[PDB]
Design an enzyme around this catalytic site. Structure first.
Site, mmCIF file in Angstrom:
data_model
loop_
_atom_site.group_PDB
_atom_site.id
_atom_site.type_symbol
_atom_site.label_atom_id
_atom_site.label_comp_id
_atom_site.label_asym_id
_atom_site.label_seq_id
_atom_site.Cartn_x
_atom_site.Cartn_y
_atom_site.Cartn_z
ATOM 1 N N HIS A 1 0.815 -1.166 0.120
ATOM 2 C CA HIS A 1 0.129 0.100 0.041
ATOM 3 C C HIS A 1 0.785 1.191 0.003
ATOM 4 O O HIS A 1 0.336 2.149 -0.093
ATOM 5 C CB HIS A 1 -0.961 0.007 1.081
ATOM 6 N N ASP B 1 0.053 -7.662 1.895
ATOM 7 C CA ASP B 1 0.705 -6.389 1.620
ATOM 8 C C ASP B 1 2.288 -6.205 1.806
ATOM 9 O O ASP B 1 2.982 -5.751 2.969
ATOM 10 C CB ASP B 1 0.038 -5.477 2.851
ATOM 11 N N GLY C 1 2.461 6.468 8.581
ATOM 12 C CA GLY C 1 4.117 6.991 8.184
ATOM 13 C C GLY C 1 5.136 6.060 8.498
ATOM 14 O O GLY C 1 6.105 5.901 8.163
ATOM 15 N N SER D 1 4.189 2.833 8.452
ATOM 16 C CA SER D 1 3.666 1.732 7.155
ATOM 17 C C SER D 1 4.762 1.343 6.205
ATOM 18 O O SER D 1 5.638 2.341 5.854
ATOM 19 C CB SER D 1 2.554 2.450 6.206
ATOM 20 N N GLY D 2 5.127 0.152 6.078
ATOM 21 C CA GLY D 2 6.360 -0.482 5.102
ATOM 22 C C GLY D 2 7.526 -0.788 6.072
ATOM 23 O O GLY D 2 8.220 -1.247 5.481
HETATM 24 N N1 780 Z 1 -2.232 1.199 14.490
HETATM 25 C C1 780 Z 1 -1.624 1.035 13.892
HETATM 26 N N2 780 Z 1 -0.350 -0.013 14.115
HETATM 27 C C2 780 Z 1 -0.905 1.345 12.523
HETATM 28 C C3 780 Z 1 0.107 1.006 11.575
HETATM 29 C C4 780 Z 1 0.444 1.500 10.107
HETATM 30 C C5 780 Z 1 -0.585 2.265 9.726
HETATM 31 N N3 780 Z 1 -0.694 2.926 8.787
HETATM 32 C C6 780 Z 1 -1.748 3.532 8.753
HETATM 33 C C7 780 Z 1 -2.103 4.424 7.683
HETATM 34 C C8 780 Z 1 -3.254 5.376 7.725
HETATM 35 C C9 780 Z 1 -3.644 6.354 6.851
HETATM 36 C C10 780 Z 1 -3.088 6.162 5.394
HETATM 37 C C11 780 Z 1 -1.772 5.431 5.227
HETATM 38 C C12 780 Z 1 -1.241 5.170 3.974
HETATM 39 C C13 780 Z 1 -1.755 5.258 2.710
HETATM 40 C C14 780 Z 1 -1.170 5.048 1.730
HETATM 41 C C15 780 Z 1 0.179 5.381 1.396
HETATM 42 C C16 780 Z 1 0.715 5.779 2.762
HETATM 43 C C17 780 Z 1 0.378 5.603 3.946
HETATM 44 C C18 780 Z 1 -1.589 4.608 6.331
HETATM 45 O O1 780 Z 1 -0.565 3.740 6.017
HETATM 46 N N4 780 Z 1 -2.561 3.672 9.809
HETATM 47 C C19 780 Z 1 -1.610 2.572 10.442
HETATM 48 C C20 780 Z 1 -1.930 2.414 11.636
#
Ligand code: 780
Ligand code: CA
Length: 223
Positions: A40, A84, A175, A177-178
């Site tokens: 994603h 993912d 932020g 993420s990844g």
């Molecule tokens: N609670 C958690 N451990 C968590 C972890 C990673 C996440 N990543 C996200 C997330 C939320 C909105 C947008 C993106 C996003 C979407 C597209 C590209 C980059 C980031 C997210 O990764 N929420 C998250 C919540």
């Protein structure tokens, strides 16, 4: 990372920042020319930034390399976030040293109770946006499948695992993420999703890397 601490410059040498004019996701260096991140996080125009600590200042040790190609898992489902995972090949190889190093892929899956290190430059507030300049770290345990499935009924597949604190307060966030979830020196997870950040009973969900090791290896071998 909410409830985490400052890692210290270059203490997490396999951590990378995916930048498209701003930092948007993390990733892990697995060899000098390949990085693993989340599907994603895909987009065109990705510059991989290695040896980073303060993402807003050049301080030394950084290597900025453009991505040659990004390979999203063929079975990635954007609605469930199953599979993912993504591989990014770098235009040129990175120079590995003590500040930039690769992390090993696992030989076995980890068990609940295993303590892991999650790091990133993602949001540090559960209510509001506060992004840090330096890399934040958090130590979190892998939870049992029953606690994970009871927290997200119907949304967990066998390619996901939960890690964190059910009491809330500490978690990965947007932020992050990844990025990496390293346990016993092996890359066991990729920050994927969760409901909000650091909310009670809503732990983080991670991509279960042990299930993709043959895929990663085959794919890198043919590209
Ligand atoms: N609670 C958690 N451990 C968590 C972890 C990673 C996440 N990543 C996200 C997330 C939320 C909105 C947008 C993106 C996003 C979407 C597209 C590209 C980059 C980031 C997210 O990764 N929420 C998250 C919540
Ligand atoms: Ca910097």
């Amino acid at each position: 990372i909410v409830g985490g601490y400052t890692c210290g410059a270059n203490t997490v040498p396999y951590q990378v920042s995916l930048n498209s004019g701003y930092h948007f996701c993390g990733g892990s260096l697995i060899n000098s020319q390949w990085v693993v991140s989340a599907a994603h996080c895909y987009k065109s125009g990705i510059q991989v930034r290695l040896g980073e600590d303060n993402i807003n200042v050049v301080e030394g040790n950084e290597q900025f390399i453009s991505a040659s190609k990004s390979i999203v898992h063929p079975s990635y489902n954007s609605n469930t976030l199953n599979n993912d995972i993504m591989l990014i090949k770098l235009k040129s190889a990175a120079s590995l040293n003590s500040r930039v190093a690769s992390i090993s892929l696992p030989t076995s899956c980890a068990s609940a109770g295993t303590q892991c290190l999650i790091s990133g430059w993602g949001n540090t507030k559960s209510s509001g946006t506060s992004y840090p300049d330096v890399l934040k770290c958090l130590k979190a345990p892998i939870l049992s499948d029953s606690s994970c499935k009871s927290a997200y009924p119907g949304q967990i597949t066998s390619n996901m695992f939960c890690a964190g604190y059910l009491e809330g307060g500490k978690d990965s966030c947007q932020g992050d993420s990844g990025g990496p979830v390293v346990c016993s020196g092996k890359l066991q997870g990729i920050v994927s999703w969760g409901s909000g950040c650091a909310q009670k009973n809503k732990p983080g969900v991670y991509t279960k890397v042990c299930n993709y090791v043959s895929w990663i290896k085959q794919t890198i071998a043919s590209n």
